[PDB]
Amino acid sequence: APTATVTPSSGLSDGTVVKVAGAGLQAGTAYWVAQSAWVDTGVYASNPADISSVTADANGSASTSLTVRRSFEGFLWDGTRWGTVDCTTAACHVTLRDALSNGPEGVAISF
Amino acid sequence: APTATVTPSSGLSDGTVVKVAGAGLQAGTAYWVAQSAWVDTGVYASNPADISSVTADANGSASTSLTVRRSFEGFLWDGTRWGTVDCTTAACHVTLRDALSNGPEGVAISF
Ligand SMILES: C[C@]12CC[C@H]3[C@@H](CCC4=CC(=O)CC[C@@]43C)[C@@H]1CC[C@@H]2OC(=O)CCC(=O)O
Ligand SMILES: C[C@]12CC[C@H]3[C@@H](CCC4=CC(=O)CC[C@@]43C)[C@@H]1CC[C@@H]2OC(=O)CCC(=O)O
């Protein structure tokens, strides 16, 4: 099943560029590569601003470049502007989800 | 029925702040606010960079600030990294959609 990795996953800051990668993905499929923080139970606030994208290769595998920040203005996956997120408090992490939300587990991160 | 308006729309450049306004929206409904180009008959390629959003007030209205750019690396609404968009040939426009794609008709812009 889908796998996901980020690097560096710890010891980061605002602007620090990391390498997100995934596996078990559906070949040719487009996977959103964004950062988030479960603002609520089951719900996320992510940063479009530095958002990114990855398409799964033949072997459901791919990769791309992200640029994480300590704090960001947050948006829900429905469009809601949740405003400013974290400053080191709650746990942001990198999301890899497609058109149907399908994706691996959220790779927790820390600042 | 739902309504949409930008200002200014014509005579634009790179980094231009526009005034998007909605109407006949569903109150409490979240509308992403993005610069996009019909890269295909139906399809759009958006700038996730300067995105905005607007929560319809009580009578289905609300507004916010958008900052346009002549050209931009684009994304399809499925996560696909489209690649660079326009330079003044194709007709980007400001889209206003909620999580179900619903929303009023994109208004024509130009640099
Ligand atoms: C694409 C998506 C809505 C748009 C989200 C995306 C996660 C990444 C993301 C981060 C943002 O901050 C902008 C919106 C966005 C790009 C979500 C992952 C799944 C979701 O879609 C749905 O819940 C509906 C799809 C379905 O019917 O399964
Ligand atoms: C949310 C959305 C995909 C994510 C899009 C959003 C338009 C605004 C937007 C701009 C970007 O550049 C990032 C993705 C994104 C936030 C689209 C509007 C409708 C679309 O699809 C759906 O969620 C509906 C799923 C379906 O209709 O099958």
Q: Which amino acid is at B74?
A: G
**Is A22 in contact with A32 (CB distance < 8 Å)?**
no
Q: Is A77 in the pocket of ligand 1 (CB under 6 A)?
A: yes
Taking residue A46's Cβ as centre, other Cβ atoms within 10 Å add up to 25
- Judge whether B78 is closer than 8 Å to chain A, CB to CB: yes
Q: Is A106 in the pocket of ligand 1 (CB under 6 A)?
A: no
Tokens 């790779």 map to which residue?
A: A107
Tokens 């078990």 map to which residue?
A: A24
The secondary structure of A7-74, three-state, reads: CCCCCCCCCCEEEEEEECCCCCCEEEEEEEEEEECCEEEECHHHCEEEECCCCCCEEEEEECCCCEEE
Query: Which of B66, B81, B96, B100 to mutate: most A Cβ within 10 Å?
Result: B81
Q: Is A93 exposed, middle or buried (0-12, 13-18, 19+ CB in 10 A)?
A: buried
Residue B101: left if φ>0, alpha if ψ -120 to 50, beta else—which one?
left
User: Which CATH architecture best describes the domain B1-111?
Assistant: Sandwich (2.60)
Ligand nearest to the CA of A100: 1
Tokens 């450049």 map to which residue?
A: B13
Copy the structure tokens of residue A62.
């791919």
Taking residue A24's Cβ as centre, other Cβ atoms within 10 Å add up to 14
The secondary structure of chain B, three-state, reads: CCEEECCCCECCCCCEEEEEEEECCCCCCEEEEEEEECCCCCCCEECCCCCEEEECCCCCCCEEEEEECCCEEEEECCCCCCEEECCCCCCEEEEEECCCCCCCCCEECEC
Q: What are the domain boundaries of chain B?
A: 1-111
Q: How far apart are CA A67 and CA A69, in angstroms?
A: 7
- The residue whose CA is least distant from atom 2 of ligand 2 is B77
CA end-to-end distance (rounded Å), chain A: 28
Largest CA distance in chain B: 39
Q: Which amino acid is at A108?
A: A
SS3 for A3?
strand
In 3D space, the residue among A68, A84, A80 whose CA is nearest the CA of residue A35 turns out to be: A68
Residues, chain B: 111
Q: What is the CA radius of gyration of chain B?
A: 13
User: Which of the 8 DSSP states describes residue A110?
Assistant: -
**Is B12 in contact with B92 (CB distance < 8 Å)?**
no
Q: How far apart are CA A53 and CA A22, in angstroms?
A: 12
Q: How far apart are CA B84 and CA B106, in angstroms?
A: 20
Q: Answer whether A53 sits within 8 Å of B99, measured CB to CB.
A: no
**Is B107 in contact with B91 (CB distance < 8 Å)?**
no
Which chain B residue shows the shortest CA-CA distance from A33? B79
Taking residue B89's Cβ as centre, other Cβ atoms within 10 Å add up to 7
